[PDB]
């Protein structure tokens, strides 16, 4: 019934380097979108958003810009991961990495460091492929 697709994703690691993280599943819902992160023994909502912002998202996720999340969780070292946080903006920039061009976005800050947010990238071609 609903448009589903999944895509691959990376986070910069403990030394600020990029690294295969796992899968980002992206599911269309009656109320907007839920994205889920499959990454080892972690498979749980990564973040989600409301119908209002879908359109924006679809653009942002294929040309950068920003959009507000209904719920943002992120991934295992982020502060936001266990409880979730609301209305977290998310700014995507297009940035080249190795031979390929990627959508990148900062995640939440990290426990228990100071000023060390997380970062993610997703292949612009896998995104453009799916969100046309």
């Amino acid at each position: 019934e609903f448009s589903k697709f999944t895509v691959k994703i990376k986070n910069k690691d403990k030394s600020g380097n990029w690294t295969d993280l796992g899968d980002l599943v992206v599911r269309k819902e009656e109320n907007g979108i839920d994205t889920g992160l499959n990454a080892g023994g972690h498979s749980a909502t990564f973040f989600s958003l409301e119908e209002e912002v879908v359109n924006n998202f679809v653009k942002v996720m294929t040309e950068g810009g920003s959009f507000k999340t209904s719920l943002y969780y992120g991934y295992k070292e982020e502060q936001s991961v266990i409880n979730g946080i609301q209305n977290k903006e998310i700014i995507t920039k297009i940035e080249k990495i190795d031979g390929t061009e990627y959508i990148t976005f900062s995640g939440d800050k990290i426990k228990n460091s100071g000023d060390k947010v997380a970062e993610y990238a997703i292949s612009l071609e896998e995104l453009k492929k799916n969100l046309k």
Partner: protein, 123 residues
């Protein structure tokens, strides 16, 4: 003075090196946890005054098994994987199987593994 003997053992872990029978003050060794265990604490202990600094700890993972997903009437929301091994600090999220609905006892479907204990929702 003030040399240490072998580094202490830790449940579900090991050192990365071969144990000397004696260490010089200020020497380090380093611990690794078993496959799915999460090391908590500094990984590297240091010898001083005849004593080893505090060792780390290996946090247990949680086995999400087909059997238990049955009893609770649930299934993994994001993978088709029928079983899952989750490391402390890792979130899992379920759904009900077609037919059941979320028991009054549960309010959320998204849990996190903490040190071998993971709170399942009931459907």
């Amino acid at each position: 003075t003030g040399k240490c003997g072998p580094p202490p053992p830790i449940d579900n872990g090991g050192i990365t090196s071969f144990p000397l029978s004696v260490y010089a003050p200020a020497s380090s060794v380093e611990y690794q946890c078993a496959n799915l265990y999460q090391l908590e604490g500094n990984k590297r202990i240091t010898c001083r005054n005849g004593q080893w600094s505090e060792p780390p700890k290996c946090l247990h993972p949680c086995v999400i098994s087909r059997e238990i997903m049955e009893n609770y009437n649930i299934a993994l929301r994001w993978t088709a994987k029928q079983k899952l091994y989750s490391r402390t600090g890792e979130s899992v999220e379920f759904v009900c199987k077609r037919g059941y609905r979320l028991s009054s006892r549960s309010h959320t479907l998204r849990t996190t593994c903490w040190d071998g204990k993971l709170e399942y929702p009931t459907c």
